[PDB]
Amino acid sequence: MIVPVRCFSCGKVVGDKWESYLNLLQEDELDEGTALSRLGLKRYCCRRMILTHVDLIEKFLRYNP
Amino acid sequence: HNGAPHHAIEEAESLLQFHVATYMDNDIAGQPQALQKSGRPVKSIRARLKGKEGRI
Amino acid sequence: LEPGHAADQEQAKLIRSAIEHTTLKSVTIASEIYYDPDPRSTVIPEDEEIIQLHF
Amino acid sequence: KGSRFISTLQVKLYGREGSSARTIKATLPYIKQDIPIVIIFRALGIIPDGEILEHICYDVNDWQMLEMLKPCVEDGFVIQDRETALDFIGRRGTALGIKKEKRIQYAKDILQKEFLPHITQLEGFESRKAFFLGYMINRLLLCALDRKDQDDRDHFGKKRLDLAGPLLAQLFKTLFKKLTKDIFRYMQRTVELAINAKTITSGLKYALATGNWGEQKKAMSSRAGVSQVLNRYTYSS
Amino acid sequence: SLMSCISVGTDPMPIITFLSEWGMEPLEDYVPHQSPDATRVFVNGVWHGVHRNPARLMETLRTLRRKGDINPEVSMIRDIREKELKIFTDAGRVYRPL
Amino acid sequence: DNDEKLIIRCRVVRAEEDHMLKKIENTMLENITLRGVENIERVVMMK
Amino acid sequence: TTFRFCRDCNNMLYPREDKENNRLLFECRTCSYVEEAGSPLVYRHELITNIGETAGVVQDIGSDPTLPRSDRECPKCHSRENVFFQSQQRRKDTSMVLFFVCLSCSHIFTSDQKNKRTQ
Amino acid sequence: EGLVEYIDAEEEESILIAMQPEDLEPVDPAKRIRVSHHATTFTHCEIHPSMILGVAASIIPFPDHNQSPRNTYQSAMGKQAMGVFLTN
Amino acid sequence: SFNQFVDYTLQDIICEDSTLIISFGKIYVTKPMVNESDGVTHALYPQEARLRNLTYSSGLFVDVKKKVFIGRLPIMLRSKNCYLSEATESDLYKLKECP
Amino acid sequence: LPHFSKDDYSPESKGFVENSYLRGLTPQEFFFHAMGGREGLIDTAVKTAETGYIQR
Amino acid sequence: DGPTMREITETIAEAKKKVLDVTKEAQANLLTAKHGMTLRESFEDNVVRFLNEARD
Ligand SMILES: [Zn+2]
Ligand SMILES: [Zn+2]
Ligand SMILES: [Zn+2]
């Protein structure tokens, strides 16, 4: 639904950086690896925790109610 | 008790034998099975003892 | 096979022949109704040696 | 397209391998015994015999089919006329019929509208039916002589799949026929509007609700498991 | 499978008229003892006729199916050994693209 | 056996022979055993 | 076995003895027709049959996409290109001979070397 | 335009298919090998062999590397996996 | 399959047994609707059908000669006779149907 | 399969997988792999039923 | 390792060459059928044995 608050494995906070990741992907047109590394995720656990998210909250949100 | 044509009594005897038969056994060879009001076969005592689901 | 002759092969193939069932359906190419009217002369021009050797 | 009529027709080469009496016969709808094929051709119209053997074995040089057909034409000589052949299908029909009336007509109907309905339902021509029976016999003979593939029942070219279209077509066909019967009975009762629409509605609703794909609830041979609850556990499912 | 679909079904009548017009003679006129070789043309399993040039016929039917005159649903099979040319238009047939 | 092609010529001894001749050939083919024991389909020699 | 039908009756021809001529005459008994036997043969079964294995050969067999091509030399025209197939007849006993149809001359020749067959 | 054609099971009888859209028409030891193209008479070709797999089986990473019974058990279990079945 | 059914096979089934000794010529398939007791028929959408347990069906009207409501055919979703076929993404989303 | 011309008795055509699961299967090999696999699975599914009946 | 994969491919290729030679002999029917087996089943048994030996 929403980006997870913390990395499941290490517990690093990754909910801070979802919109920064989207901005680096769209505005700056950086590849996935560069965007993640510049956001400061070194461990592949955190890196997949941001890379594999699906922004299902948008789909659920923009119904009527 | 009333008039006894000897052919309608034969028909009624056949019906009552058929009914006792389907009541006690619903797997007759070469005879239609008794159907219940809902159209499924009626559950006979043989059936209630018959298979794995049966009583034994 | 027999005890004193088990190591042999001549008896083994002999008894294979003696027990193996043989039917004509295996060996006949064609068993056929022909017309040969006469005994002395055969209609098939090549068959003759059969009756020459009889004679 | 319609009438949902599966006129199963069997054609059997009675006998066994190495047996002399190798007799080919065939079945008809509502006939109790396998009519010999030569009698079927007689009924269809091929009174002559060489025409029958030509309709069966196309390659005259290939004597083997005629050789295996010899018992058939030997034992089918008991009829040599079209009327007699229809009448023989009549004797096996046994519908309390007379030599001319209600019996030759039954045989004509059986051999016209019920023998291979897919070829042609029309009255005009029945040589198609004879040629197709000849082809079918040729295929049976070739399999008997081991010259052709015995059809595998599991081959998808020979299989078909009834999707929602054909299945609902079958159900609506039976439900509509029931509706026609109901309105016809109502019109008869009007000796001197009023259509049960719930007949089509509720029956179709049941057949989808329970999966029992049957013309009526009363039939236990409905072949259940046609409609199932959609399993929305996950998208892949 | 993923790229697999079921034929809805089509009317074969256009195919029969075309087969008639392209030289498939009727079945009544078929005379096997004069004709030792000729493909048997079937449509939906009905032996509609015979044809003396299956190669030319099949090329025509193929080209028509590609160009779209004949529905891509229908399947046409030329069996050279059995000397048959079977056309199937009925529904429920499973097909995949290529 | 020396002949390159070997045949058997069989004859019925001394009417209406042609009708039963096929049945005679049928029986003389299936129900005749040249050697062996009945039911002995195939026999293999191993060590 | 060769077989022929009674003229302008179109029915098969049973055999019958002529001991007075000591000859074979096929007689049709539906109509009083009789004719001398063309060949002494009156029947054929071929418990093993050597025919039908090449069945299906046509002029355009060589243009069938589905068959496997081969690079064998045709005996007459010395043409390398062929299409090869197994025996169309099947038995558990029948061997695995390959029959080669030469596309140039549509001629059938066999993978066996001991025995040559024209067809 | 006749660039793709539909083939059913019965018409599959009389067509020779190419596997790879380019390879069979005209090596690193771990690299994929193929039966040589001794036939120059191909008539069709696969769009991609992966499409033989169905919906549940095509979720799988490397089914060819899997064993086939495990591919079947996965195809059964993926239907039972947990996820978002619909956005509503 | 359902589309070709509702378009062609339904007409064929009616036309095969039109005649009777009272003849049926043409069958109309309307959009899905609900005939509610002590009320007026209104357009019925799939979400309302699921939520109120209503069967999602459309009346079949047949003409008869010497229009009658012969019954209701349940409509397969996203067929040619439903509201969601001529629906864009935002239309579905306003209709509470997920794309 | 459709991809081999007829009369092809070679191991590749007749089910011989040339290479391992580490290294991967060509799609013909994978389909023959699947056919063998569900042969095995069906064989166990029927053998369990038989063996249950024999044990009972 | 690479040498092992190379030699594995070598053994598989040798088995394939052996199967091809057996096939060619069968096609020219120089192969006598094994006792108690026909020529088709003999060829199939030889092939399956050689493929199993190669895999082993
Ligand atoms: Zn982490
Ligand atoms: Zn005559
Ligand atoms: Zn040549």
XYZ file of C-alpha atoms in Angstrom, chain C residues 3-54:
52
model
C 22.618 -81.266 -14.016
C 25.521 -83.008 -15.738
C 24.716 -81.280 -19.043
C 23.782 -77.753 -17.950
C 27.096 -76.239 -19.062
C 26.495 -77.574 -22.585
C 24.969 -75.573 -25.445
C 24.064 -78.270 -27.947
C 21.449 -79.660 -25.582
C 20.266 -76.184 -24.645
C 19.545 -75.203 -28.240
C 18.121 -78.676 -28.867
C 15.647 -78.296 -26.006
C 14.840 -74.760 -27.115
C 13.851 -76.283 -30.449
C 11.972 -79.085 -28.694
C 9.902 -76.767 -26.458
C 9.447 -73.678 -28.665
C 5.922 -73.649 -30.077
C 5.774 -73.531 -33.876
C 2.707 -72.421 -35.849
C 2.308 -72.213 -39.613
C 1.128 -68.595 -39.301
C 4.710 -67.637 -38.460
C 6.422 -69.445 -41.331
C 4.048 -69.346 -44.331
C 4.369 -66.314 -46.576
C 1.213 -67.333 -48.434
C -1.089 -70.387 -48.225
C -3.373 -69.996 -51.201
C -6.122 -71.706 -53.183
C -4.877 -72.395 -56.706
C -6.331 -74.179 -59.714
C -4.211 -76.976 -61.123
C -6.524 -79.111 -63.299
C -4.141 -81.949 -64.224
C -1.648 -83.892 -62.054
C 0.947 -84.404 -64.772
C 1.120 -80.750 -65.930
C 1.049 -77.681 -63.672
C -0.301 -74.314 -64.792
C 2.438 -72.346 -63.001
C 5.348 -72.576 -65.500
C 8.005 -72.582 -62.742
C 6.441 -75.080 -60.293
C 7.264 -78.156 -62.406
C 10.185 -79.514 -60.349
C 7.653 -80.422 -57.634
C 6.027 -82.972 -59.966
C 9.133 -83.972 -61.941
C 10.717 -85.061 -58.647
C 7.491 -86.888 -57.758
